[PDB]
Amino acid sequence: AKQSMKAREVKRVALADKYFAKRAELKAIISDVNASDEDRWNAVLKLQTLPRDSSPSRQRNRCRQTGRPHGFLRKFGLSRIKVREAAMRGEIPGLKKASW
Amino acid sequence: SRYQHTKGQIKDNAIEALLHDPLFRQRVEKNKKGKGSYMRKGKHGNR
Amino acid sequence: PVNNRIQDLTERSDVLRGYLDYDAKKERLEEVNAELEQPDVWNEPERAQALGKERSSLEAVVDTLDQMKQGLEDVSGLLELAVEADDEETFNEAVAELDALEEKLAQLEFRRMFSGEYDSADCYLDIQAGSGGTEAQDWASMLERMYLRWAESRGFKTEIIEESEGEVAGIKSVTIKISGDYAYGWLRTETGVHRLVRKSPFDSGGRRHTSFSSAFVYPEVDDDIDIEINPADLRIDVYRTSGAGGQHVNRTESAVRITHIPTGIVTQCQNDRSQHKNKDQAMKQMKAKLYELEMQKKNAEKQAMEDNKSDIGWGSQIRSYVLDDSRIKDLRTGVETRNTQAVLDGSLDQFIEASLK
Amino acid sequence: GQKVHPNGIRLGIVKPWNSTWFANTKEFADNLDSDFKVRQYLTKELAKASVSRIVIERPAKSIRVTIHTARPGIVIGKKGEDVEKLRKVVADIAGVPAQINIAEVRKPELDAKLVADSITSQLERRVMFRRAMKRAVQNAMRLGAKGIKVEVSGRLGGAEIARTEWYREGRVPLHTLRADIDYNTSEAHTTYGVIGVKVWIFKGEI
RNA sequence: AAAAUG
RNA sequence: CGCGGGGUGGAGCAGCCUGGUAGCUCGUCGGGCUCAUAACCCGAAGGUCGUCGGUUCAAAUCCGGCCCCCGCAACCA
RNA sequence: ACGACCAGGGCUACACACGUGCUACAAUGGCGCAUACAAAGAGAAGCGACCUCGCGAGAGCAAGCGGACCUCAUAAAGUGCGUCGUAGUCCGGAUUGGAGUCUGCAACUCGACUCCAUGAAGUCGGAAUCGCUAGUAAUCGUGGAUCAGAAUGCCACGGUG
RNA sequence: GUACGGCCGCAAGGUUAAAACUCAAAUGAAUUGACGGGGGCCCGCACAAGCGGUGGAGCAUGUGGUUUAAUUCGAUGCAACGCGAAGAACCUUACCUGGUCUUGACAUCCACGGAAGUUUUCAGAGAUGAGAAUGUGCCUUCGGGAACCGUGAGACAGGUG
RNA sequence: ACCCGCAGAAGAAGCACCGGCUAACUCCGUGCCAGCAGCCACGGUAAUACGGAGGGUGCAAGCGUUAAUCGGAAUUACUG
Ligand SMILES: [Mg+2]
Ligand SMILES: [Mg+2]
Ligand SMILES: [Mg+2]
Ligand SMILES: [Mg+2]
Ligand SMILES: [Mg+2]
């Protein structure tokens, strides 16, 4: 993708890194049945106010080499095509052009 | 500067008439590489 | 947001200004006022009449565009004071006299679409496909669709009257009626042959094509079937029928000839026995011939008008739709649009004002 | 354009692995990316000096990178300070402290990548492409290559149409899986366009 | 038996 | 102006003769076939029955006015 | 500014035309009640036995498993009874509403799912056309990958055959 | 091999025989091809023989067409149409209607003032813009550099155009 | 006519062409537009062919041009 796109997700990642525990605690109390109603309300608005970029939802995982979000992989962290390219060069350990 | 109206004595529509004569022809590119492409001698020729 | 709109308006005005000649019409006005301010100007009535009104018409442009430049600034200044001091009324008074200026601009814009005898009347357009065989047809349909989109965007009733579809795919000929407020004004300047460059899908070898399709736009005229010819214009003359009939036909003024006095067209009849049938039959025939005369004169005037347009020639090739390079260059516009997909979706606002200018 | 990438079909057959490390799914992707970055850095640095490929191995969170080069005189330099400096940057890129090992390739024209690089260089400094290719092939033959196929594609000599041009000499068994096919690609950033230099060199049958 | 055209 | 025959979906034809209940071929639209188009195969839509009055339970259908077209007649002199 | 940052709308429009997948039209079936066979996967900002509460999706509670051990997951067709008696049916489940649960800043355009109702078309499909030579087609299920979240797709694994 | 004229012809026409204008070829043989509704050979679920579809219905999805302020863009016989998007709620995202930033969103080169970070108060759809409390890492004959922000100038960015 | 004396490069160079033929090639508008051309057609957004600029080539007070005539035409062939 674009460099701008890459920058965006970097920023989002940073925000996530910053804000997670704060986010987490709020989530926890939202979940909790044994909790005050007013407190819960307060938590929910906090969450509403607190950044959208800080959320793991806005985290659209992209290619860590190029930037493509489509064709992502949790094993390699790259675009499918890019993974293939790497693989063929021998740059990936384990990945064989195999048959079963 | 005149254009010699292939159509001649234009009575009704001038635009349409003109569009239906050599001045507004269907012009086709003589592309390389593919179909209708081959040239025996190039623009600059063989060396 | 409002202050940036002011600047846009100013910019629009400035661009309008050059073509309408602010530096030449102001000079022209100098010379009229040099002669007409002298009491001895009515020695010649004939020339003075033509100049007197002209100057009056030109004062309503130069001075008003000076009252626009003077206006925008004042309103802006009016706006500045209020916002800074958190006053509300002046904000409202700053918008309301900017409001006048838009109307003035429209009027000046209207003055471009006012020039001509036919402007607000109902509108027709014929998109005739070129010589391409299939490519031309394809182009024509595209053009039609673009026109439809434009109509939709502007806000007009679009009525497809005749539609001859392509032999493979597209349009060979299409006549659409577009009704509404100044409908012909927007579309009069669109009249011409459209140069399409494209990599064709119908060519098996996938050649590149220079294709053409006329989009002849014309307004709907008043019907005016026949003028009721009053008896002062007709010259009715009776005489004897040629031929056989003993004592009876030799002694009848049954045959009649009617001649139109100013024209010189003459219609005779000696068919029926009665004078009175003939008179009305030869009048019916006379009327018919008068229509032809009036039809033929209108057709010849049309012919001569169109032979002027013919002698423009390559100038009819108006707007080059270079789709193979995205950019579109109209001959009078001098500008290129990199979004072909918006152009095709009826956004010719960039092309109407420049071609009209 | 159609075929398998030979280096990727032989990666568990005749070709030893370019990547020789184990990481968990949690810590795989990032590691891979780091490795790629290091490779890129190496390419940036030692393009003027003749390099072919690198093999990466990381045991006990302490990396050893094997570098396949043609000439050690410029790659190492006069002293091991430059090497140390290079290592530092790799360490920075990766995380853990970095160690490297260097390997001089015997018969530089037997390896494909170096040849490809040379061809690219020739293309850049404006020489007759065809002739250069022919020369390369001849050199390979002289050196004792059992087969060599070279292939260049597109925009050759500033032509308005793409030019696919290839020379084949000896036996180049692309289909034999037990064959030692050394295949590399170097893509020339010329003034007229991009010319893709493809090169297979058949070394031996095992 | 049938296949006109690009 | 006289006598006669018509005006029916986009084109041409019935149906009107004797009241109820709208068909035929071509096209039009939609699919299919084919690399496409044409032909062909399948499916579908389209009508205040020239217009207006009247009688009739009810009118394309009957009758009259009006309009358009066609034909015949438009004579002895 | 054809550059970038944000917010929402959209990319899910809707008279339609097509393509491609799925569920259908039934008693080889539909459902209810007992019961059998797996294979292959995927997992520590994870899976989550046991116990408890929920119609239930799911919660609490509290072990274990970097995982042939802990789990996700009971394979479903099949078999064993019961029914209904060819109806627009105890077919099919669409749609339209109601009552709830997770997920995430947040389901309104715009997620599923738990449930209650609702019962559209359709009773094997015109012309035309398509796949497949044996574990193949046909058909029943089970995973996975992209996934906070969300497959009738796709990649794969197995059952009948 | 035609005009006109002649000669011949009952006629059909025949015979003799031009010119203007026009084109850059017109052909002939053979050669490689491709093609043949030519011939021979063989082969593929190509037909046949069969098994189920689709096409008819509803549902999922994708396209087109129309539409919308915008319906990102590409893919177009097979070999485009559950395709690229292995997953459009926000993001994605490219697009529109608004609000905003101009060495830029992302780089690198600086010159310097300030270590980063740590905590919070309001307005707004939010982008962001100020304010109030807390702070000061490695060697240093220790000007400072390594890190992290601000500032202005240019190089240049950048663009899913 | 020619010859003797004087100063100073002083006052005497440019057109045609550069795709191949046909000796000589690159860059800037341009974009099947404008234009080119003896012929095979250049020009369709990178023109060694247009048009200009720079670099040439060959002539030379010229140089092209069309024309005319012969050649090359062994394209009327007695030669052949
Ligand atoms: Mg359908
Ligand atoms: Mg003759
Ligand atoms: Mg269907
Ligand atoms: Mg030369
Ligand atoms: Mg001769």
Please report, as a single letter, which amino acid is at residue C89. Answer: E
Neighbours of D41 (CB within 10 A): 15
CB C257 within 8 A of CB C271: no
- β-bridge partners, D101: D66
| Candidates B29, B30, B32, partner chain D, best to mutate (most D CBs within 10 A) | B32
* Residues on chain A touching D8 (C-beta within 8 angstroms): 87-90, 97
Burial D16-33 (b: 16+ CB within 10 A, else e): ebbbebeeeeeebbebbb
* Residue linked to tokens 């959208």: A52
| CA C308 – CA C315 distance, rounded (Å) | 12
Instruction: Please give the Cα distance from C321 to A5 (Å, whole number).
Output: 33
Are residues A93 and D39, on separate chains, in Cβ contact within 8 Å?
Answer: no
Structure tokens at C282: 């030869």
Which residues sit opposite D182 in a β-bridge?
Answer: D201
The separation between the first and the last C-alpha atoms of chain C, rounded to the nearest angstrom, is 29
Mutate to test the interface with B, among D155, D161, D163, D164 (most CBs of B within 10 A): D161
Per-residue H/E/C for D76-108: CCCCCHHHHHHHHHHHHHHCCCEEEEEEECCCC
What does the block give as tokens for C12?
């629009």
Q: Is B33 on the interface with D (CB under 8 A)?
A: yes
Which residues in chain B have their CB less than 8 angstroms from residue C212's CB? 19, 24-26
CA of D31 to the centre of ligand 2 (A): 96
Distance separating alpha carbons of residues C295 and D186, to the nearest angstrom: 78
Of B15, B16, B26, the CB nearest to C132: B26
Q: How far lies C90's CA from each of C73, C75, C81, C82, C102, in Å?
A: 15, 9, 8, 6, 19
**Does residue A99 sit within a domain?**
no
**B8 burial level (CB within 10 Å; 0-12, 13-18, 19+):** exposed
CB D8 within 8 A of CB A89: yes
* Chain A CB within 8 Å of residue D15 CB: yes
C2 CA distance to ligand 2 centroid (A)? 91
**A48 within domain boundaries:** yes
Strands D179-189 and D98-104: unpaired
Q: Which two tokens stand for residue C182?
A: 């100044």
Whether A36 maps to a domain, the answer reads yes
Q: Count how many domains chain A has.
A: 1
Instruction: Kindly give the residue spans of alpha helices, DSSP state H, lying in chain D.
Output: 6-9, 29-45, 72-75, 81-94, 112-124, 129-143
Strand segments, DSSP code E, in C91-207 are 123-129, 157-165, 171-179, 192-199
Q: Report which DSSP code applies to D116.
A: H
Q: What angle, 0 to 180 degrees and rounded to 10, lies between the N-to-C axes of helices D129-143 and D112-124?
A: 150
In DSSP notation, C174-211 reads: EEEEEESTTHHHHHGGG-EEEEEEEE-SS-TT--EEEE
Buried b (16+ CB within 10 A) or exposed e, C320-346: bbbbeeeebebbebeeebeeeeebbeb
Rounded Cα–Cα distance for residues B13 and A50 (Å): 68
Q: Is residue A17 part of a domain?
A: yes
Q: Which domain holds residue A75?
A: 1-90
> Nearest CA to CA, how far is A47 from chain D (Å)?
29
| Chosen from A88, A95, A96, A99 to mutate, greatest number of chain D CBs within 10 A | A88
Query: Is residue B31 within 8 angstroms of chain C, CB to CB?
Result: yes
Measure CA of the first residue to CA of the last residue in chain D; give whole Å. Answer: 29
Method: cryo-EM
User: How many CA atoms does the CB half-sphere of C303 hold within 13 Å?
Assistant: 10
CA distance B23 to chain D (A): 29
**What are the φ/ψ torsions at residue C50 (nearest 5 degrees)?**
-70, -25
**Do C and D make contact, counting contact as 3+ CB pairs within 8 angstroms?**
no
User: What are the distances in angstroms from CA D41 to CA C145, C286, D6, D38?
Assistant: 54, 99, 25, 5
Tell me the backbone φ, ψ of residue D184, rounded to 5 degrees. -145, 155
Query: What single-letter amino acid sits at C282?
Result: A
CA gap D49, D197 in Å, rounded = 19
Q: What is the four-CA torsion angle of C92, C98, C99, C104, rounded to 10 degrees?
A: 160
**C-alpha to C-alpha distance for C198 and C322, rounded to whole angstroms:** 7
Resolution (A): 3.5
Q: What positions of strand H are covered by protein, i.e. any atom < 7 Å from a CB? A: 65-68, 70-74, 76-77, 84-94, 98-100, 105-107, 118, 124, 126-127, 158-161
Structure tokens at C115: 């020039």
Element (H, E) at C254: none
